[PDB]
Every structure is written in structure tokens, then in C-alpha cells.
Amino acid sequence: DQWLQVDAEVTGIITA
Amino acid sequence: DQWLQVDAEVTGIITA
Amino acid sequence: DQWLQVDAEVTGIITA
Amino acid sequence: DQWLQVDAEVTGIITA
Amino acid sequence: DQWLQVDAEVTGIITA
Amino acid sequence: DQWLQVDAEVTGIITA
Amino acid sequence: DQWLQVDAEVTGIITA
Amino acid sequence: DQWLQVDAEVTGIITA
Amino acid sequence: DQWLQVDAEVTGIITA
Amino acid sequence: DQWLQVDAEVTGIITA
Amino acid sequence: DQWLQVDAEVTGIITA
Amino acid sequence: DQWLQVDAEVTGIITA
Ligand SMILES: [Ca+2]
Ligand SMILES: [Ca+2]
Ligand SMILES: [Ca+2]
Ligand SMILES: [Ca+2]
Ligand SMILES: [Ca+2]
Ligand SMILES: [Ca+2]
Ligand SMILES: [Ca+2]
Ligand SMILES: [Ca+2]
Numbered sequence: 001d002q003w004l005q006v007d008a009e010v011t012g013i014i015t016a
Numbered sequence: 017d018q019w020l021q022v023d024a025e026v027t028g029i030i031t032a
Numbered sequence: 033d034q035w036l037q038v039d040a041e042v043t044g045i046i047t048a
Numbered sequence: 049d050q051w052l053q054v055d056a057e058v059t060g061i062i063t064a
Numbered sequence: 065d066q067w068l069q070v071d072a073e074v075t076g077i078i079t080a
Numbered sequence: 081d082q083w084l085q086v087d088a089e090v091t092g093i094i095t096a
Numbered sequence: 097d098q099w100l101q102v103d104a105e106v107t108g109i110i111t112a
Numbered sequence: 113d114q115w116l117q118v119d120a121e122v123t124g125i126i127t128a
Numbered sequence: 129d130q131w132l133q134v135d136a137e138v139t140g141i142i143t144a
Numbered sequence: 145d146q147w148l149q150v151d152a153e154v155t156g157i158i159t160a
Numbered sequence: 161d162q163w164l165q166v167d168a169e170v171t172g173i174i175t176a
Numbered sequence: 177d178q179w180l181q182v183d184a185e186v187t188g189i190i191t192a
Binding site: 097 | 160
């Protein structure tokens, strides 16, 4: 899976 | 329902 | 939403 | 709240 | 399943 | 437990 | 953690 | 992830 | 319900 | 328990 | 909180 | 997704 970091803005992404 | 956008501060609200 | 207070009897209600 | 009956098609709605 | 009604005392039971 | 297959109609049941 | 027994009144507390 | 649309028949699939 | 104890092997069962 | 306030930065902590 | 590691035997504990 | 079989040791993995 991808995890999207949300703070709103998207501040990151992980990769699954 | 109302959704309150929380960022902490409240940065929005939706209206249900 | 309405919240119904349950104790059984209903002992209250909130109002959403 | 509204409940939407989903079967896809929407086959109903309840009203809260 | 059995459902036990809890109020604490047990005030009921359902029968599954 | 019994599982009731819901599609609305009931289209099946499993038996627990 | 503390568990508070709620019946409404608070009827107990456990201590975690 | 793949999402399989279930209606029973499988009526779709999404791709993650 | 039956609870099956899983450790993999099945190491027990409870019976509901 | 301690609650850590996350905003990312840690912006607080509660104490349980 | 304490976390108890369960494997059945208890094989550990963390401490909160 | 990958599923990791945990028993502690990792005793397997599935792949999604
Ligand atoms: Ca996934
Ligand atoms: Ca609602
Ligand atoms: Ca922020
Ligand atoms: Ca059951
Ligand atoms: Ca259908
Ligand atoms: Ca009572
Ligand atoms: Ca084991
Ligand atoms: Ca806790």
C-alpha cells in the first residue's frame, strides 16, 4: 500500500 | 452531521 | 444526530 | 443522518 | 449466541 | 451463529 | 488505566 | 490493493 | 460460538 | 496513559 | 499500560 | 499486501 502523509496538505508518501 | 476539519486549530466545517 | 441516553429505560435525549 | 440503500444501484434512502 | 442484558445486575437473557 | 446472505432479498443462510 | 464503572452514576473505579 | 466489487456475483475489480 | 485456540496449530476448542 | 498531541511535530503531551 | 506478550504461555511483558 | 505469519518468530509470508 501507499501511505499518504496528511497534515490540509499532503506532506509525504510511503510505498505494498 | 457536521464534519469539523481539525489541523491544533479548526480550519473548516461541512454540513446531515 | 440524536443521542438517546439508555440506562432498561431511556433517560434522556440530545440533539445533528 | 440519511441512510442510502445500496445494492450497483441506489435503491432507497432514509432520513437525522 | 446468548445476549445477556446488563444494567450492575444481569436483567435478562436472549437466545444462536 | 447463522449467517444470512443479503443481496434487498435474503438469498441464503448458513449455520454455530 | 483506570476503569470507571458507569451505570447515570459512577458506581465504581478500578486501577494501569 | 485490489478492490473486488461484490453484488452474489463479482461485478468489478479495481487496482495498490 | 466455538472458539478455536490457534498457536501454526490448533491447540484447543471451546463451546454458543 | 500518555496522550501525545501530533500535528509532523509533537505539539503536546497529557498524562494514566 | 502493560503489554503482556502471549504465545499458550506468557513470554514477556512491557511497561504506561 | 504482504501478510507476515507471526508465531515470537516470523514463520511465513504471503504476497497485493
Ligand atoms: Ca492494503
Ligand atoms: Ca450521524
Ligand atoms: Ca498542521
Ligand atoms: Ca456468535
Ligand atoms: Ca444485487
Ligand atoms: Ca441502571
Ligand atoms: Ca507458538
Ligand atoms: Ca491504556
